[PDB]
Amino acid sequence: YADSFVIRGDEVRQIAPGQTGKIADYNYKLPDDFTGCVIAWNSNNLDSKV
Amino acid sequence: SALGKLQDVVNQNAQALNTLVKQLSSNFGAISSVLNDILSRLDPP
């Protein structure tokens, strides 16, 4: 399965098994025996607009 | 009005059963030895 979304820059540390915070609490929660991989890259020029 | 051979069996068994119960208040290198306080002061991982 591939899940996709957009978050802040310093919220990428809550996408991991066993974390807390406004993102992992109630936006997107990863089980505690996760198996896959997590990939993330900056996208300032595409998603941020004056 | 002697029976020490019968008292020894009772004594050794009661004393070996007392040690098993006393071994429940030891952390064995955890924070505490009571399964709730470990459980209501940390999160699952």
* Nearest of A42, A38, A44, A33 to residue A4 by alpha carbon: A38
| Resolution given for this structure, in angstroms | 3.1
Q: Enumerate the residues of chain A whose CB falls inside 8 A of the CB of residue B43.
A: 18, 20
* Nearest of A18, A37, A13 to residue A29 by alpha carbon: A18
Q: Position B13: which residue type?
A: N
As a whole number of angstroms, the distance between CA B43 and CA B45 comes to 6
**Structure obtained using:** cryo-EM
Q: Where are the alpha helices (DSSP H) in chain B?
A: 4-22
Contact by Cβ (8 Å): A23, A15:
yes
Within 3-42 of A, beta carbons closer than 8 Å to B belong to 17-18, 20, 32
* Nearest of A41, A49, A48, A36 to residue A2 by alpha carbon: A36
Cβ neighbours around A15 below 10 Å, total: 20
Contact by Cβ (8 Å): A40, A34:
no
